[PDB]
Amino acid sequence: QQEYLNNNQLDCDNTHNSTYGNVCNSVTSCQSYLTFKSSSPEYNTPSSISYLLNSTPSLVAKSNNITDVTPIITDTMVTVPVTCSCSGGRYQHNATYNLKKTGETYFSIANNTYQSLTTCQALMAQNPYDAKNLFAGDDLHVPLRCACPTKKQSDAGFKYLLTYLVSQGESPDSIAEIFGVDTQSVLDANELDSKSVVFYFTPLLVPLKTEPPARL
Amino acid sequence: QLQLVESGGGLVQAGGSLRLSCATSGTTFRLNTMGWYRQAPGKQRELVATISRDFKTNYADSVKGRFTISRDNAKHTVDLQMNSLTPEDTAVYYCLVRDQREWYGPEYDNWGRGTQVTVSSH
Ligand SMILES: *[C@@H]1O[C@H](CO)[C@@H](O[C@@H]2O[C@H](CO)[C@@H](O[C@@H]3O[C@H](CO)[C@@H](O)[C@H](O)[C@@H]3O)[C@H](O)[C@H]2NC(C)=O)[C@H](O)[C@H]1NC(C)=O
Ligand SMILES: *[C@@H]1O[C@H](CO[C@@H]2O[C@@H](C)[C@@H](O)[C@@H](O)[C@@H]2O)[C@@H](O[C@@H]2O[C@H](CO)[C@@H](O)[C@H](O)[C@H]2NC(C)=O)[C@H](O)[C@H]1NC(C)=O
Ligand SMILES: *[C@@H]1O[C@H](CO)[C@@H](O[C@@H]2O[C@H](CO)[C@@H](O)[C@H](O)[C@H]2NC(C)=O)[C@H](O)[C@H]1NC(C)=O
Known part of the structure; x- marks a missing residue:
């Protein structure tokens, strides 16, 4: 289980524990998965998506049953295999981001570019630049949100945790059905209860009994 | 969509207190x-108190x-903690939750089914 990000990432002055990343509460390193919506024209191939998220094109290709050079239709959700490891008490997958245009902000990078796979707070925590002092060409360390199964999760047969970007009209019920797991397992993975609010566009952890499907 | 569950109303003696949730x-x-809004007999549904996500509050004058x-x-x-109640506070109390369903999209009212609060005479 990890705490639910719970829209705390929408305000850069928010300092809730969850905005700084999943907490290192299990094994030091593991296979994990991100999800990401293909965006044209910058991030719509395995090479460009893997460049943004620091995966490999072949891992993205095999995870989605495509070739490593196939274009991906815009808004297609793709799974991205990543290594998840502990760093300073947090689970995260490290990536790098070179700012393209002056005008980008810590929030625009977390919310738009990385589609809430990281947060304003974590970017600011792990980068020396001031929020007012970002420019085109600056290199940013990007802590992407991932986690490793706890002993209790592993004992129940969950081999991976997947970071799922929730879309409009989805619910814990519908998301669990995509991955062949019980709804309660998804709630438990995010320390939610049957009577909780889940937000569109916020990452949600999904425990997996096997590798995710090739198409979501 | 959203489901709202209100609780904590009921009958109370004048001068008593109740906690709505x-x-x-x-x-x-x-x-x-x-x-929280309330509708007394024969009255409109009127604001009692609101609170933003950043905890900015707004209270009806009769209630401050x-x-x-x-x-x-x-x-x-x-x-809603309600102290020093009077019969003039007798009403059906409704919770209001405002939500947005997309970035910069319209805001929607979500209303609970209402909880009866009845304050007995002193
Ligand atoms: C946080 O990020 C989200 C996306 O992750 C931003 O919302 C999205 O904004 C874009 C435009 O920036 C909208 O997509 C489309 O834009 C083009 C403009 O050329 C147009 O073809 C379409 O009409 C459409 O609007 C998109 O609808 C919107 N929402 C989503 C879910 O993608 C949001 O603005 C960011 N928030 C902040 C505060 O910066
Ligand atoms: C931030 O969170 C960590 C972890 O929080 C715990 O695990 C979450 C998934 C959730 O269940 C929380 O309620 C838990 O507290 C905190 O570290 C824990 O601290 C407690 C109390 O000091 C300690 O007993 C636990 O062993 C710690 N757990 C782990 C996994 O390290 C940490 O203190 C929090 N930091 C802040 C600033 O709030
Ligand atoms: C991911 O990045 C973090 C920093 O954000 C790295 O953490 C550092 O790791 C080295 C050991 O290799 C330590 O000396 C530093 O003190 C660590 N920093 C913190 C803040 O803990 C982490 O190693 C990176 N992981 C990978 C796999 O690249």
């Missing part, structure tokens, strides 16, 4: 202002000092 569940993009609104952003609940 409302829990929200379901899905949305953002939960904005939450609040006696009532206190609170908000739990971890579990998405809103509570």
